[PDB]
Amino acid sequence: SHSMRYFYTAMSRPGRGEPRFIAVGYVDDTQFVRFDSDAASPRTEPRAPWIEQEGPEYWDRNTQIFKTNTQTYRESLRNLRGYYNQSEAGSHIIQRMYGCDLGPDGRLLRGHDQSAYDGKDYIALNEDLSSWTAADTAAQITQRKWEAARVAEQLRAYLEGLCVEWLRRYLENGKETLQRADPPKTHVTHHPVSDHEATLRCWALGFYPAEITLTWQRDGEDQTQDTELVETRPAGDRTFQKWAAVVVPSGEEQRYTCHVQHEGLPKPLTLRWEP
Amino acid sequence: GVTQTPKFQVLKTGQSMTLQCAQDMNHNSMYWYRQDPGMGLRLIYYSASEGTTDKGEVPNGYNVSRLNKREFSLRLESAAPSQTSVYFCASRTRGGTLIEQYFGPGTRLTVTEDLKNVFPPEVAVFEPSEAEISHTQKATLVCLATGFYPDHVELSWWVNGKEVHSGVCTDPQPLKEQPALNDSRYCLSSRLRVSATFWQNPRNHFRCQVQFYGLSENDEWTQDRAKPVTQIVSAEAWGRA
Amino acid sequence: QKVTQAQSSVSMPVRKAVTLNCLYETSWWSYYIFWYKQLPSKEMIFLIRQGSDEQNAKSGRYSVNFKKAAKSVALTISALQLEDSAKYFCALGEGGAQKLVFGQGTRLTINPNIQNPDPAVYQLRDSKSSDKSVCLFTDFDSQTNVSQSKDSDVYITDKCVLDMRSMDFKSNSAVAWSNKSDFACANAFNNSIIPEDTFFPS
């Protein structure tokens, strides 16, 4: 279920210069492009080896788009400041996520386009790719303008067309990394915390993509509410790490098993603490 | 919409001229194009928004300035005959699908080596043929505007206090009186056809009116003939039994 | 060229349909094609747009046959009216900037249905203000074409369609004039192929 996503950030900074526009693109959990208008001569830069297979026109054209976006989001920030009757002295941020989910037939499974203002939902393209959900009265102004401008029709064409076509292209150009799931390396540790309790921590290291399920079971019963589960974290080499811990009564450790589900595993793993 | 001034302009080789454009549609993207006769439009400069002009993207012989959100200017710094063209300004919205460009009415600009080449039209109205009236019970008046340069004219027919369009046909483009020449003067013909009974009433008043665009009061003129300034040249006819 | 309109001129009778071809070249992954018509006043009128990621465009009497692989984007105008006579331009707008590249255009002439042809050449009355003699070729069928004169002192204008709206009457005409004493309407249009039944009054 591959996907392509772009994440846009535009932040106003009155007095400290023009609004800053940042764009990053992802195929699944792999970042492949970056644009930051804060550079002296801003350019789109590669963030994955396979995107460097594109020719010079690709980079020039992406830079043109993102440079234009820098100017367009400056106007959008002014518009929203007017919608909310906000002062010209405060700093505000627009965030946006959009992209396509690839179905098994090589065509669009689901399209996405969501925006936020100051960290709160603002407007979103509905699943039919033909209508919008506005969060508040201000976003209903954007909705009316985008209904008349037919923005949903533009987005639907992109999501069903170029987004799918170029995601399939990237998946091919980098299939030796993008289409190779890396299974986690796994082990279980044991730490006493009292005379009668101990910590069982189940580790998953070096896996890709980030999607994974680590669960503890006691006599085959899920221990979700009792499990400390840290956020999946990046290793720095495009792989990820995660662990799950449970505090158990001393002497029950054999009743506890760790279950690891990941795309790179031939079969789901069942792990125990082995003294 | 998109407005442009001036609508017509004649220049001597080496003169400067600034063309003005404005759009009231809240657009950001604006354009200057030029159209040589018989050709399509060709881009001169694209202004995505207010800001400093990239002189490296401005073709030689032109200056452009985005004055504000609405106003966009194009200057010929030293007019050359090859810059004879119809200059179009355009604007568009960005985003969505309705991104087609709105064009201004254009500036029809002719550059000539000597303003002694500029002549207003002679305008004459020719009354209907008696043979046409008896054969068809209709009456066709013909208006001829001849000997004008540049080809910057607007012809209209006026009947009993109104500009009319029914029964009217004007040539879509002028003809060169001497096609083998480059500074040739131009001709234009137009017809107005009415019923015999309408033509036969002497109370009916027909007028062929040709707005010509030429020199202004700021231009110098040393020739002995009248200064060929922008002016209306007209000819009239009244019905007769 | 980057945008090619291979038809220089097209004629089609009223109430019928016409297809105007356009070919383009581009390496952009995203673009639009636009069709405009231009009036003799030089006014540009937008007709229809075709996005590279969109299905075949249709807007009223205008439709686009978008063949993306062949980069062909022909415009079809159905139920033609006399008002459709104009010069039609195909324009390519690439990427974000939309710096339009225009074809050379195609002049479309919609010919009226002359119901009761009465081809004739009439001499108009001389103007006391002018030294020119004027002849009018009129009421011929739309199958007749008007050629320029072979005499340098005789000027001839192309055929023109007028519409007497209150009488539901359309007629073609062309004008010929000269200030020479050897000029006569009997020979004004000798260089054109005029109908054999053309009326020359006494």
């Binding site: 764009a23 234009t68 367009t72 170029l162 | - | -």
Partner: peptide, 9 residues
Amino acid sequence: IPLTEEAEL
């Protein structure tokens, strides 16, 4: 590739 052109909010 990103969306080729952005609308103002």
